[PDB]
Protein backbone atom coordinates (compact mmCIF):
# COMPACT_ATOMS: atom_id res chain seq x y z
CA UNK A 1 0.00 0.00 0.00
CA UNK A 2 3.53 2.20 0.02
CA UNK A 3 4.38 4.32 2.57
CA UNK A 4 3.69 8.18 1.54
CA UNK A 5 0.86 6.84 -0.61
CA UNK A 6 -1.48 9.21 -0.60
CA UNK A 7 0.49 11.91 0.86
CA UNK A 8 0.73 15.29 -0.35
CA UNK A 9 1.38 14.23 -3.59
CA UNK A 10 -2.50 15.40 -4.38
CA UNK A 11 -0.79 19.22 -3.49
CA UNK A 12 3.15 18.06 -4.23
CA UNK A 13 5.69 17.31 -1.57
CA UNK A 14 8.42 18.75 -3.23
CA UNK A 15 9.85 20.86 0.06
CA UNK A 16 10.84 23.26 -2.58
CA UNK A 17 7.29 23.73 -3.16
Same mark, same amino acid.
Given at each position: ?? #?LSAF? #??FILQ #? !? !?
Open positions: EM #RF #RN #R !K !K
